[PDB]
Design an enzyme around this catalytic site. Structure first.
Site, short mmCIF file in Angstrom:
data_model
loop_
_atom_site.label_atom_id
_atom_site.label_comp_id
_atom_site.label_asym_id
_atom_site.label_seq_id
_atom_site.Cartn_x
_atom_site.Cartn_y
_atom_site.Cartn_z
N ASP A 1 2.26 9.67 -26.10
CA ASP A 1 1.49 10.91 -26.01
C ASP A 1 0.77 11.16 -27.32
O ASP A 1 1.17 12.03 -28.11
CB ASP A 1 2.43 12.07 -25.67
N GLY B 1 0.79 26.06 -25.76
CA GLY B 1 -0.30 26.36 -26.67
C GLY B 1 -0.10 25.66 -28.02
O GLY B 1 -1.03 25.63 -28.85
N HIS C 1 -2.02 14.47 -23.66
CA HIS C 1 -2.13 15.42 -22.54
C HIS C 1 -3.09 16.56 -22.85
O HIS C 1 -3.41 17.36 -21.98
CB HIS C 1 -0.76 15.94 -22.02
N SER D 1 1.11 22.32 -28.20
CA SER D 1 0.89 20.89 -27.98
C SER D 1 -0.17 20.29 -28.88
O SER D 1 -1.17 20.94 -29.15
CB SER D 1 0.47 20.63 -26.56
N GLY D 2 0.09 19.09 -29.39
CA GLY D 2 -0.85 18.42 -30.27
C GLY D 2 -0.77 18.83 -31.72
O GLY D 2 -1.36 18.19 -32.58
#
Ligand SMILES: [Ca+2]
Lengths: 56, 222
Positions: free
Chosen positions: B84, B174, B40, B176-177
Protein backbone atom coordinates in the site's frame (compact mmCIF):
# COMPACT_ATOMS: atom_id res chain seq x y z
CA UNK A 1 -30.25 -6.84 -3.06
CA UNK A 2 -27.06 -4.89 -2.46
CA UNK A 3 -29.05 -1.66 -2.76
CA UNK A 4 -30.61 -2.41 0.63
CA UNK A 5 -27.28 -2.94 2.36
CA UNK A 6 -26.04 -0.30 4.78
CA UNK A 7 -22.98 1.74 3.75
CA UNK A 8 -19.58 0.15 4.37
CA UNK A 9 -16.63 2.40 5.28
CA UNK A 10 -14.12 -0.45 5.50
CA UNK A 11 -10.72 -0.73 7.31
CA UNK A 12 -8.69 1.80 5.33
CA UNK A 13 -8.14 5.27 6.76
CA UNK A 14 -8.99 7.66 3.93
CA UNK A 15 -11.93 10.09 4.01
CA UNK A 16 -13.44 9.64 0.54
CA UNK A 17 -17.01 10.87 0.02
CA UNK A 18 -19.16 8.35 -1.83
CA UNK A 19 -22.89 7.72 -2.34
CA UNK A 20 -25.09 4.88 -1.19
CA UNK A 21 -28.73 4.18 -1.81
CA UNK A 22 -30.76 4.64 1.36
CA UNK A 23 -33.92 2.60 0.76
CA UNK A 24 -35.61 4.12 3.83
CA UNK A 25 -35.23 7.69 2.58
CA UNK A 26 -35.72 6.62 -1.01
CA UNK A 27 -32.60 8.48 -2.15
CA UNK A 28 -28.86 8.34 -2.56
CA UNK A 29 -26.89 9.83 0.29
CA UNK A 30 -23.24 10.50 0.98
CA UNK A 31 -21.05 8.57 3.44
CA UNK A 32 -17.34 8.32 4.22
CA UNK A 33 -15.53 5.49 2.44
CA UNK A 34 -12.13 4.47 3.83
CA UNK A 35 -10.53 3.70 0.50
CA UNK A 36 -10.60 -0.07 0.28
CA UNK A 37 -12.83 -3.13 0.23
CA UNK A 38 -15.91 -1.41 -1.09
CA UNK A 39 -19.21 -3.27 -1.18
CA UNK A 40 -21.58 -2.71 -4.09
CA UNK A 41 -23.77 0.03 -2.54
CA UNK A 42 -20.94 2.54 -3.03
CA UNK A 43 -21.05 4.98 -5.98
CA UNK A 44 -18.92 7.83 -7.19
CA UNK A 45 -21.89 10.07 -7.97
CA UNK A 46 -25.58 10.43 -7.19
CA UNK A 47 -26.41 9.78 -10.84
CA UNK A 48 -24.65 6.39 -10.87
CA UNK A 49 -26.39 5.60 -7.60
CA UNK A 50 -29.89 6.45 -8.87
CA UNK A 51 -29.30 4.65 -12.16
CA UNK A 52 -28.23 1.44 -10.42
CA UNK A 53 -30.37 1.45 -7.25
CA UNK A 54 -33.14 4.02 -7.69
CA UNK A 55 -36.51 2.58 -6.69
CA UNK A 56 -35.05 -0.51 -5.00
CA UNK B 1 -5.87 11.17 14.84
CA UNK B 2 -7.76 9.98 17.97
CA UNK B 3 -6.24 10.89 21.32
CA UNK B 4 -3.58 13.16 19.92
CA UNK B 5 -2.61 16.80 20.37
CA UNK B 6 -2.41 19.92 18.18
CA UNK B 7 1.02 19.84 16.51
CA UNK B 8 1.50 23.57 16.20
CA UNK B 9 1.55 25.56 12.94
CA UNK B 10 4.10 24.09 10.49
CA UNK B 11 5.93 21.99 13.07
CA UNK B 12 5.52 18.97 10.75
CA UNK B 13 6.77 20.65 7.48
CA UNK B 14 6.81 17.45 5.45
CA UNK B 15 3.09 16.81 6.00
CA UNK B 16 0.86 17.40 2.99
CA UNK B 17 -2.87 17.21 2.35
CA UNK B 18 -4.24 15.49 -0.74
CA UNK B 19 -7.24 17.50 -1.95
CA UNK B 20 -9.88 16.52 -4.48
CA UNK B 21 -12.35 19.26 -3.65
CA UNK B 22 -11.80 18.40 0.02
CA UNK B 23 -9.12 16.72 2.11
CA UNK B 24 -9.25 12.96 1.59
CA UNK B 25 -5.72 11.74 2.52
CA UNK B 26 -2.34 12.85 3.82
CA UNK B 27 1.14 12.36 2.39
CA UNK B 28 4.82 13.13 3.04
CA UNK B 29 7.11 15.37 1.03
CA UNK B 30 10.33 13.41 0.40
CA UNK B 31 11.64 15.56 -2.46
CA UNK B 32 10.83 19.10 -3.69
CA UNK B 33 8.87 17.47 -6.48
CA UNK B 34 7.78 14.13 -4.98
CA UNK B 35 5.27 13.01 -2.37
CA UNK B 36 4.73 9.54 -0.92
CA UNK B 37 1.26 8.39 0.22
CA UNK B 38 -0.91 5.27 0.25
CA UNK B 39 -1.97 3.36 -2.85
CA UNK B 40 -5.61 3.33 -1.68
CA UNK B 41 -5.48 7.14 -1.78
CA UNK B 42 -5.14 6.98 -5.56
CA UNK B 43 -7.57 9.40 -7.23
CA UNK B 44 -7.58 11.40 -10.43
CA UNK B 45 -7.40 15.20 -10.21
CA UNK B 46 -5.34 15.34 -7.04
CA UNK B 47 -4.13 18.71 -5.77
CA UNK B 48 -1.34 18.62 -3.19
CA UNK B 49 -1.43 21.25 -0.48
CA UNK B 50 1.79 22.07 1.34
CA UNK B 51 2.56 24.37 4.26
CA UNK B 52 -0.93 23.74 5.66
CA UNK B 53 -2.03 24.04 9.26
CA UNK B 54 -5.72 24.98 9.23
CA UNK B 55 -6.96 23.13 6.12
CA UNK B 56 -10.08 25.30 6.03
CA UNK B 57 -8.68 28.83 5.79
CA UNK B 58 -5.95 30.38 3.67
CA UNK B 59 -3.23 31.51 6.04
CA UNK B 60 -0.53 32.51 3.58
CA UNK B 61 2.12 29.79 3.97
CA UNK B 62 0.37 27.44 1.53
CA UNK B 63 1.45 26.14 -1.84
CA UNK B 64 -1.19 24.25 -3.84
CA UNK B 65 0.36 22.17 -6.62
CA UNK B 66 -1.46 19.61 -8.71
CA UNK B 67 -0.04 16.17 -9.36
CA UNK B 68 1.34 15.49 -12.82
CA UNK B 69 1.82 11.77 -12.15
CA UNK B 70 0.55 9.20 -9.61
CA UNK B 71 2.46 5.90 -9.45
CA UNK B 72 0.90 3.14 -7.36
CA UNK B 73 3.21 0.27 -6.42
CA UNK B 74 3.08 -2.32 -9.25
CA UNK B 75 2.29 -5.05 -6.73
CA UNK B 76 -0.34 -3.23 -4.67
CA UNK B 77 -3.14 -5.66 -3.81
CA UNK B 78 -6.46 -3.95 -3.12
CA UNK B 79 -7.81 -7.02 -1.38
CA UNK B 80 -4.93 -7.79 1.02
CA UNK B 81 -3.67 -4.19 1.22
CA UNK B 82 -0.14 -5.47 0.64
CA UNK B 83 2.26 -2.92 -0.92
CA UNK B 84 0.00 0.00 0.00
CA UNK B 85 2.36 2.68 -1.30
CA UNK B 86 2.17 5.34 -4.02
CA UNK B 87 4.38 8.14 -5.35
CA UNK B 88 2.92 11.43 -6.58
CA UNK B 89 4.95 13.71 -8.82
CA UNK B 90 4.18 17.43 -8.42
CA UNK B 91 3.47 19.39 -11.61
CA UNK B 92 6.11 21.88 -10.43
CA UNK B 93 8.61 21.77 -7.59
CA UNK B 94 7.63 23.13 -4.19
CA UNK B 95 9.60 26.03 -2.74
CA UNK B 96 11.35 24.46 0.27
CA UNK B 97 11.02 26.45 7.18
CA UNK B 98 7.29 25.66 6.82
CA UNK B 99 7.72 23.27 3.83
CA UNK B 100 10.51 20.69 3.97
CA UNK B 101 11.11 17.09 2.92
CA UNK B 102 11.55 14.13 5.26
CA UNK B 103 14.41 11.63 4.98
CA UNK B 104 13.90 8.07 3.83
CA UNK B 105 15.11 5.41 6.30
CA UNK B 106 18.60 3.86 6.16
CA UNK B 107 17.17 0.83 8.03
CA UNK B 108 14.02 -0.60 9.60
CA UNK B 109 12.96 0.48 13.06
CA UNK B 110 12.51 -1.92 15.95
CA UNK B 111 9.58 -2.65 18.25
CA UNK B 112 9.42 -0.07 20.99
CA UNK B 113 10.71 2.81 18.88
CA UNK B 114 8.65 5.97 19.53
CA UNK B 115 7.25 7.68 16.41
CA UNK B 116 5.20 10.74 15.47
CA UNK B 117 2.03 10.12 13.49
CA UNK B 118 0.20 13.18 12.08
CA UNK B 119 -2.93 14.05 10.11
CA UNK B 120 -6.25 15.87 9.69
CA UNK B 121 -8.36 12.76 10.19
CA UNK B 122 -11.30 12.01 12.47
CA UNK B 123 -10.56 12.63 16.14
CA UNK B 124 -13.37 10.43 17.54
CA UNK B 125 -13.39 6.65 18.03
CA UNK B 126 -17.18 6.65 18.38
CA UNK B 127 -18.41 9.46 16.16
CA UNK B 128 -17.19 12.03 13.67
CA UNK B 129 -15.16 15.15 14.24
CA UNK B 130 -12.63 16.44 11.75
CA UNK B 131 -10.15 19.04 12.97
CA UNK B 132 -9.19 22.27 11.20
CA UNK B 133 -5.58 22.11 12.41
CA UNK B 134 -3.02 19.31 12.14
CA UNK B 135 -3.04 16.71 14.97
CA UNK B 136 -0.05 14.77 16.30
CA UNK B 137 0.41 11.48 18.11
CA UNK B 138 3.45 9.74 19.60
CA UNK B 139 3.02 5.96 19.39
CA UNK B 140 5.51 3.10 19.66
CA UNK B 141 6.16 0.54 16.94
CA UNK B 142 4.79 -2.83 18.11
CA UNK B 143 6.30 -6.28 17.68
CA UNK B 144 5.53 -8.30 14.61
CA UNK B 145 4.25 -10.96 17.01
CA UNK B 146 1.56 -8.85 18.68
CA UNK B 147 0.60 -7.23 15.38
CA UNK B 148 -0.04 -10.68 13.93
CA UNK B 149 -1.95 -11.70 17.07
CA UNK B 150 -4.17 -8.60 16.67
CA UNK B 151 -4.86 -9.35 12.98
CA UNK B 152 -4.64 -13.13 12.31
CA UNK B 153 -3.46 -13.89 8.80
CA UNK B 154 -3.66 -10.28 7.66
CA UNK B 155 -0.21 -8.86 8.43
CA UNK B 156 2.44 -9.21 5.68
CA UNK B 157 6.17 -8.51 5.84
CA UNK B 158 5.38 -5.08 4.40
CA UNK B 159 3.21 -3.92 7.33
CA UNK B 160 3.78 -2.97 10.97
CA UNK B 161 1.49 -2.11 13.86
CA UNK B 162 1.91 0.91 16.04
CA UNK B 163 -0.16 2.28 18.89
CA UNK B 164 -1.62 1.10 22.17
CA UNK B 165 -3.31 -2.19 23.00
CA UNK B 166 -5.51 -0.34 25.50
CA UNK B 167 -6.98 1.77 22.67
CA UNK B 168 -7.79 5.49 22.76
CA UNK B 169 -4.88 6.73 20.64
CA UNK B 170 -4.82 5.87 16.92
CA UNK B 171 -4.93 7.10 13.31
CA UNK B 172 -8.39 7.23 11.73
CA UNK B 173 -10.37 8.13 8.57
CA UNK B 174 -8.65 11.02 6.79
CA UNK B 175 -5.16 10.11 8.06
CA UNK B 176 -4.31 7.53 5.34
CA UNK B 177 -1.10 8.18 3.45
CA UNK B 178 0.28 10.34 6.22
CA UNK B 179 3.72 9.95 7.86
CA UNK B 180 4.98 7.81 10.77
CA UNK B 181 8.33 9.45 11.52
CA UNK B 182 10.82 7.86 13.89
CA UNK B 183 14.20 9.38 14.70
CA UNK B 184 13.74 11.80 11.81
CA UNK B 185 13.19 9.15 9.16
CA UNK B 186 9.99 8.22 7.41
CA UNK B 187 9.28 4.66 8.64
CA UNK B 188 5.61 4.26 7.83
CA UNK B 189 2.55 5.36 5.89
CA UNK B 190 -0.88 5.35 7.64
CA UNK B 191 -2.82 2.52 6.08
CA UNK B 192 -5.63 0.63 7.85
CA UNK B 193 -7.01 -0.84 11.08
CA UNK B 194 -10.24 -2.28 12.57
CA UNK B 195 -12.19 0.85 13.46
CA UNK B 196 -10.20 3.53 15.25
CA UNK B 197 -8.60 3.51 18.69
CA UNK B 198 -10.19 0.15 19.57
CA UNK B 199 -8.66 -1.98 22.36
CA UNK B 200 -6.39 -4.74 20.99
CA UNK B 201 -6.72 -3.29 17.50
CA UNK B 202 -3.72 -1.02 16.80
CA UNK B 203 -3.28 0.82 13.51
CA UNK B 204 -1.46 -0.90 10.67
CA UNK B 205 1.16 0.96 8.61
CA UNK B 206 3.11 0.39 5.39
CA UNK B 207 6.74 -0.47 6.29
CA UNK B 208 8.66 2.16 4.28
CA UNK B 209 12.16 0.69 4.91
CA UNK B 210 11.28 -2.18 2.52
CA UNK B 211 10.68 0.20 -0.42
CA UNK B 212 13.57 2.62 -0.25
CA UNK B 213 15.25 1.13 -3.35
CA UNK B 214 12.01 1.19 -5.37
CA UNK B 215 11.26 4.74 -4.29
CA UNK B 216 14.70 6.16 -5.16
CA UNK B 217 14.81 4.45 -8.55
CA UNK B 218 11.17 5.26 -9.38
CA UNK B 219 11.69 8.93 -8.53
CA UNK B 220 14.80 9.06 -10.74
CA UNK B 221 13.25 7.51 -13.82
CA UNK B 222 10.07 9.63 -13.95
CA1 LIG C 1 -4.64 26.73 5.22
Amino acid sequence: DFCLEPPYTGPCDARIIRYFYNAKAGLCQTFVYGGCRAKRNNFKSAEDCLRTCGGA
Amino acid sequence: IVGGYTCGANTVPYQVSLNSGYHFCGGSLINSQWVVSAAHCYKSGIQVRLGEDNINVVEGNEQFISASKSIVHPSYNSNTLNNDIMLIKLKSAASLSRVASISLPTSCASAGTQCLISGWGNTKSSGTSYPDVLKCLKAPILSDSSCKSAYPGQITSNMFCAGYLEGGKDSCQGDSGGPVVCSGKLQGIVSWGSGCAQKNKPGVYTKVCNYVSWIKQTIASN
